[PDB]
Design a binder for this molecule. Structure first.
Ligand SMILES: [Zn+2]
Length: 105
């Protein structure tokens, strides 16, 4: 499930940290991290997305943690681009926004 996706994401990014995934209802987004505690919190709606969209969210959030930034910097996007090349991250973000009408951090 989500756990298996997360392991694949850590392997691709080369990020061996014991990041924990929590599912919690969120108001203002569908996903966010804790840098301090090494967690990714997902709104339950994420669990019903297509696999590539779920994987995007995990990669996006893991990229925040790895790049150690909340700002979507060039080094942030470099991590994302280990999976989603070129224009693909924005395409998948658009799909997720169409479906859920909510943003990830
Ligand atoms: Zn972000």
């Amino acid at each position: 499930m989500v756990e298996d996706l997360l392991e694949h994401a850590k392997d691709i990014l080369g990020y061996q940290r014991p990041v924990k995934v929590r599912i919690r209802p969120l108001k203002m987004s569908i996903a966010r991290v804790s840098f301090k505690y090494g967690t990714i919190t997902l709104d339950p709606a994420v669990l019903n997305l297509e696999e590539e969209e779920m994987f995007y969210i995990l990669i996006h959030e893991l990229a925040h943690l790895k790049a150690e930034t909340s700002y979507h910097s060039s080094s942030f996007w470099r991590e994302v681009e280990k999976v989603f090349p070129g224009e693909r991250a924005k395409e998948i973000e658009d799909r997720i926004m169409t479906k859920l009408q909510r943003n990830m951090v």
